[PDB]
Design a binder for this molecule. Sequence first.
Ligand SMILES: CC1=C(C#C/C(C)=C/C=C/C(C)=C/C=C/C=C(C)/C=C/C=C(C)/C=C/[C@@]23O[C@]2(C)C[C@@H](O)CC3(C)C)C(C)(C)C[C@H](O)C1
Ligand SMILES: CC1=C(C#C/C(C)=C/C=C/C(C)=C/C=C/C=C(C)/C=C\C=C(C)/C=C/[C@@]23O[C@]2(C)C[C@@H](O)CC3(C)C)C(C)(C)C[C@H](O)C1
Lengths: 165, 69, 169
Amino acid sequence: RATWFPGAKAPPHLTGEFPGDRGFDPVDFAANPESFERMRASEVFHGRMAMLGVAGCLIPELLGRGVWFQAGESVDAAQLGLYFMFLAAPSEYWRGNGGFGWDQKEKKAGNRIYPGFDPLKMTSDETKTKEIKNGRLAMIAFLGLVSQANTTGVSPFQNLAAVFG
Amino acid sequence: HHLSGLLGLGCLSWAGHQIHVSLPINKLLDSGVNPAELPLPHDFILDKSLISQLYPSFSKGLAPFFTFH
Amino acid sequence: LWFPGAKPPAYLTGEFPADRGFDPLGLAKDPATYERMRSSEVFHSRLAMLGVVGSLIPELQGQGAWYTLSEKQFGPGPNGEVIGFTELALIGMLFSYPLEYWRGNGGFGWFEEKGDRTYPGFDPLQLTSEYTKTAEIKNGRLAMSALLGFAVQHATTGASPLENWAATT
Ligand SMILES: CC1=C(C#C/C(C)=C/C=C/C(C)=C/C=C/C=C(C)/C=C/C=C(C)/C=C/[C@@]23O[C@]2(C)C[C@@H](O)CC3(C)C)C(C)(C)C[C@H](O)C1
Ligand SMILES: CC1=C(C#C/C(C)=C/C=C/C(C)=C/C=C/C=C(C)/C=C\C=C(C)/C=C/[C@@]23O[C@]2(C)C[C@@H](O)CC3(C)C)C(C)(C)C[C@H](O)C1
């Protein structure tokens, strides 16, 4: 199989079964298959949130709203944050629990990674891979945004301008 | 693990503390700055202007590091 | 029982503590919903017992009231930060994310946890007994009543609850 480095063998617990598997788990975080489930959950969620984060950072600046690290000087962030926490706290508790219910068998019921929203029915393993590969690229780019902010102190698109002049 | 982790990362971490906390505070103190009116250590991290006055290279941030300059 | 001329409704059988035979609208019908109910009762109960004292004691010392926590500027911090109730609530929500998740989960993992969730393990003097299990719920029912009392007394009169108690003594 193809791997994250030219001639590297895969770990034995990574067998290509799950989407995104390019044989990369050196510190064996996922030898136990329950921990591999949790990690898969975490990777898809971190993944999605970074897509919304990156799009939340770039797309407004294109449609003339401002630079993403100057966002809280034109809004009242403390307020919004409280509302954001008020929408999250049920919603993330349901996602963790598996559904609405004080029983523990609730966690077995339902999917906490792929809950089943799909109205145009295009969930495959080639599309599950696309989520994860877009997600990983958004995570990596978010770390680039923060870093450039700190170093250059200017807009992310103005960092792209300096590449070409 | 003991070479790369315990001693390696241990030295990296402690160089990190030195660069970001021990070097400013000592530099200011050696120029007679009365410890009561010294900035707290995070202030060197949050406000890069404080640490820029002392060491101007910080104004270039991490770009030199990544371009091997 | 809550009422002398009342009879215990089936499921309520005096097994669990503070069962004073009382469920008119039949909300603890299923024995599994009675589990949630019980956990919610002891949670609401503990929060109220912390609420009453946390509303009176600053009032008595001279800070304010159960009301007027809004428009208060909580401040002199280490760097001279001064923040408002909104920021303080945001802090409270940020530091309540993992504590509440872990109490709602039973533990720390993505799978089944054996962790009580109603009466967790914290008793370094071994004082847990039916007396005390009862006494916590009873005091907390009182305290819940008292907090509803605070609310409506301030709603009707517009006075602070120490002044309303000084208008009876
Ligand atoms: C049992 C039963 C029934 C019932 C019932 C009953 C009576 C239910 C009652 C519910 C009730 C009464 C539940 C309240 C809880 C209060 C909480 C959570 C306290 C938090 C509040 C806190 C933590 C306080 C915080 C503060 O003080 C601080 C720290 C500083 C102050 O400056 C500001 C405030 C004040 C904010 C039916 C319906 C009749 C029929 C059914 O069949 C059977
Ligand atoms: C996989 C693996 C390993 C690894 C690893 C690696 C490389 C991990 C890397 C993880 C990485 C890089 C994860 C980034 C997440 C970023 C998020 C959540 C971004 C944004 C989140 C949001 C919501 C953004 C919000 C906002 O932007 C909005 C929307 C508008 C702005 O105005 C304001 C703000 C900024 C608030 C080992 C350890 C090497 C070995 C092991 O064996 C296997």
